Paper text:
Penicillin-binding proteins (PBPs) catalyze the two last reactions in PG biosynthesis (GlcNAc-MurNAc polymerization and stem peptide cross-linking, or transpeptidation). Class A enzymes can catalyze both reactions, while class B PBPs act uniquely as transpeptidases. Within the elongasome of a variety of bacteria including E. coli, Caulobacter crescentus, Bacillus subtilis, and Helicobacter pylori, PBPs have been shown to interact with, and be recruited by, the essential protein MreC, a bitopic membrane protein that is essential for cell shape. PBP2 (residues L38–L588, thus lacking the TM helix) is a 588-residue molecule that presents the characteristic fold of class B PBPs, with an elongated N-terminal region followed by a transpeptidase domain that carries the stem peptide cross-linking site.
The transpeptidase domain harbors the active site with the three conserved motifs: S–X–X–K (Ser311′–Val312′–Val313′–Lys314′), which includes the catalytic serine, located at the N-terminus of α2; S–X–N/D (Ser366′–Val367′–Asp368′), which lies between α4 and α5; and K–T/S–G (Lys513′–Thr514′–Gly515′), located at the C-terminus of β3 (PBP2 numbering indicated with a prime symbol). A structure-based sequence comparison of class B PBPs from rod-like bacteria using the closed form of H. pylori PBP2 indicates that residues that line the head/anchor interface display clear similarities among class B enzymes. In addition, in structures of unbound class B PBPs from both Gram-positive and Gram-negative bacteria, analogous hydrophobic patches are covered by their respective anchor regions. This mutant was unable to bind MreC in conditions where wild-type PBP2 could generate a stable complex in gel filtration.
Numbering used by the authors: 45 to 520, 540 to 588
The structure:
Amino acid sequence: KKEFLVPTRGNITDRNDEFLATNELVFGVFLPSGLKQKDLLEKIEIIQKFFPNFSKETLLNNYQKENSLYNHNLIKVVGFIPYATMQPLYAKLIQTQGIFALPLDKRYYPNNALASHVLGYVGVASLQDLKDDEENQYSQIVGKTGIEKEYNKLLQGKVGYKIMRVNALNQELATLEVVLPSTNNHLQLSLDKRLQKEADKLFENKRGAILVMDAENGELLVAGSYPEYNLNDFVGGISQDKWQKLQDDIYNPLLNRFANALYPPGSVVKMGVGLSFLENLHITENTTIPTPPFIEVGKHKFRDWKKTGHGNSNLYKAIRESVDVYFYKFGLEISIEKLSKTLREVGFGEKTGVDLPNEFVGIVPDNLWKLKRFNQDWRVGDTLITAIGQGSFLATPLQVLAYTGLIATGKLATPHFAINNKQPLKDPLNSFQKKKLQALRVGMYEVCNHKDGTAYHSTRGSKITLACKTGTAQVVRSHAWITAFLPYEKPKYAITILVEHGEGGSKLGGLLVKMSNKLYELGYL
């Protein structure tokens, strides 16, 4: 009756205990390391006769990896046999000289690509990891991206292993007992597997990102970066080829588009700019100015999204019909310092503070930044391009999401996955600003619900009342934003949707409606 230190790792579940990440128990077949080239092939022969399956080439190959996840110092793993298969042939395989069968509780992702950039994958700990370590983290198995890395310590458990017993008695079958577990390491995410699937359906041929947040605390119900990758491909430690084809896909599936990609926010920053206008200028939301197809400054002319122009327009209307010239005009009057302050406040400067390694911060172009990095001081027209969320203005979908959350509720939520991060709501806006958000919400409600709103024909057939804002980002065909909260009458959720080359905002409303309806259908509303 032999016992084994079986390497295991914690479970990752969705907000309803549905398994996002877990383990399956197998046997690894191992050979002694530093083995003679003549022995090796001979012992490989015996293994494939036991398990007529394994390709003589892939066993040799396996034995020769220099980044195996489960290798010992003096024995190397050549293959992964299911318990069903190993059971009958354990004893005779033990009996053969120089061959070992060791239980391994390896990673298994049941839903494959689902939430791949959220969950992330386990891998062999590298030399640059080890050389940089400041916490006596000497484990060969560690998380490499997303949650796996973020909570590696929690998920790895106390020592990284559990103790199992195998009884290949006089009997002809191997039983398997767990004598000591590795407990206190289940992690529970706020995701809803069911919603994440609807998100996966919505982006079936598309590229970009989608987030659905509880704006009262930060819980991310959905978080997709499309295209996703199939986490299982990384389980034994990624196949050198399988790695290539993930790196060479021109759609770039390794990138996290919701946390680690930048984009101009475009028209979506209009509420925030408008807030700055109200703070800093002798204006109310109801102040009405004329808004031709264009105005000019000196050398250049600044054009409205469409050439008809809009006639007269106040802030409600500007938001409603995404009027570029309103913002160009008052952009002339506002100070970039006072603008960029407003923008930073509502989130666009720094990180949202999400449970993922290396969240990206964007760029809020101000005047102290043009002088430092470049040389000339800030020109007036530069404000105007920033006022409509383009030029050197870059942001993540999370920043847009969090901004939307702030506009909806008055307080900045910290988007997170891990359910047990009490993430207290931050309050960056003052009483006057919170008061003035009221206008902005009505604005956003008009975009979705007033017949001239840009997303009116877009967002029809919605169970719950939506307040939304569409945008486009120019490319460094145009990226399309839609960002929203619901219900309008009493806001709880925020949704942010980015499609690369979706082009507009009145294709995306259909997606907002779809996800919004799937929420009501599953009783979140």
